[model samples]
Target: ENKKIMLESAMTLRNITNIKTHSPVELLNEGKIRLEDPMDFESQLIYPALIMYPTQDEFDFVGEVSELTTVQELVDLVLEGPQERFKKEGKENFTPKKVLVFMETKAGGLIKAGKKLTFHDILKKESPDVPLFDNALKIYIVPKVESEGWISKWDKQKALERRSV
Candidate 1:
């Protein structure tokens, strides 16, 4: 009976709290965050974000945040490291236009549906926690890259779908 209650307590701890154990991408890819039915008393909606520059080969890990973080807030986080590195490497005028955030789904992969949302916007759609009024974010850094071009494809697809309807 003692062992059973101990096991039950352990299970409740795992189910009720937000434990930061994995990288953002790993959490998403592994389906760690329970968006479907989160516990009401705890806020476990932290996201692990993968940050990539347009030129680098390795990607960075940024963590424990949601869409409620503003554009400037995210930019500040990125600028502290990746953008600074680009400057030190003599990459001139390395002004980032915007950061693209992809929402990872279990059935599908990183989704672009409901695209172009801030981190807050994305989290706002699904986060079960009370809305964060302060800058209560955690950052774990790593570094990486992807190029630009495929964004126009979203518009193209949207237009095509509109025509089909």
Candidate 2:
């Protein structure tokens, strides 16, 4: 796709283990990078909503990335979380199950020309034709707000959950 050119270089955080889902407050306490810098992401809050079932080959989802972030941000900030709070709250609250990392171009929404597609859409369309490093893996991007918002903001979960269905 035309969007691939914008990618500024991406990094990855492979093998993200541990997934003991719980309240956001509890999750923030953990000393993981995943939760630290939500702002580093252009659409940190909006991402999970659009990419329902993220996969290893994420490029397939966005076609091309523009501004990739640091592994530190993805790991210590976005994926894992912080340390102090995690110590106070206890890791029991923010439990992780599995983690996978990938490098990609950034800043693009799913949907081009009114066509509903997935990461598979871009990969299947490009790949052999475009030529990538072959590091991108398939993964999902489920968000707390979409899955169990009650844990984050119970008061607002009632309305957001109904936005689609």
Candidate that would win on lDDT: 1
The models' CA-based lDDT, in order, is 0.37, 0.25
Off by over 4 Å in 2: 1-66, 70-73, 76-82, 87-90, 93-165
* Candidate 1 residue pairs in clash (backbone atoms < 3 Å): 24-48, 58-143, 58-144, 59-143, 59-144, 60-142, 60-143, 67-119, 67-120, 68-120
Model 1 lDDT tens row, 116-162: 34554543444332121112222212121221343322343432232
Tens digits of per-residue lDDT, candidate 2, 1-165, equal 222221211111211112222332222342222212343423211111112123122211322221233222323233354423333322233323333222221111111211122322233343222112222222323322333432233233432232222
Q: Which model scores highest in TM-score?
A: 1
TM-score of 2: 0.18
Consecutive 10-residue window with the lowest summed lDDT within model 1: 130-139
Candidate 2 total steric clashes: 46
- Give the total clashing residue pairs for model 1: 10
Q: What's the lDDT of the predicted structure labeled candidate 1?
A: 0.37
